[PDB]
Amino acid sequence: EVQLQQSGPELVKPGASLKISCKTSGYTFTDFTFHWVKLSHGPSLEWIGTIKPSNGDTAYNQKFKGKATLSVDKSASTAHIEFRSLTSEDSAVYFCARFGGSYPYAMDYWGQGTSVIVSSGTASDIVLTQSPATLSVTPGDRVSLSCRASQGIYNYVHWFQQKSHESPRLLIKYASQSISGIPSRFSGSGSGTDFTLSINSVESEDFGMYFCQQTNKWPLTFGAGTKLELKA
C-alpha cells in the first residue's frame, strides 16, 4: 500500500518561513517526481513545482519562484516545501503528489493536504478552458465535461475528481487511459485541443469538482474546474 502522509495543520505570523513535509511509504521514494499543488477558493488548483527525488533537480511555476523551495530527504523518504515571507495570500491547502504508477506516469497518489493559515492576528502558459463551468443534474443523467487547450498538446491531458474536504483523485490519464479502481462509468476521449470526460450515469457520490490538467509543456497547468452538483 502506497501512501503519502503530510505534516499537520499550520498557523503562522506574516513574514514567517515555514517548512511542510510529505513522507512516503510502501514504495521506493526515489522512483517518481514529487509535485506540490495549492488549493484556493472555487475550489481552484495551481501547480507550484516539482522535484526529481533521485537527484534533486527541480522545475518551478515562475509565479512561485520567489516564494517556495522544494527539497527531499532521501534518508527519511520525505519531500519538503519551504515557504518564505508568508502573507495572507499564501493561506491555502497545499497537497503533495507523486507522478507515477504504470507507464506512462501521472499524479496517481496524493497526500491528504496541509492547511496553512497566515494569521492576521487579534503569457505562453497553456490555458485549459473547462465547460460547462456548472452541471446541475439528477443522479442517473449522462454527462460530458469539456477541456479545450489553447494549443495542441497531443494526448497530454489528465482528469481529476475533487470532493469536498478530500484530495484530488486521478480518474483518467493521457486523455483516455483508464485508472485501476476507478468505476467504468468514467471515460475520456480527445486529442490535440478538445478533450472530454464522460460519466455514463451520474451517481450521488460523483458530485464535486472536476479538473483537467496538461503535462505537455512547462509549467504544468490546470483548468478552472467544472462543478458537478445535484439539481435543486
Partner: peptide
C-alpha cells in the same frame, strides 16, 4: 514533448 525527460525518463 519538453516535459518527457524530466517526468517520464
Amino acid at each position: 514533448n519538453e516535459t518527457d525527460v524530466f517526468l517520464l525518463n
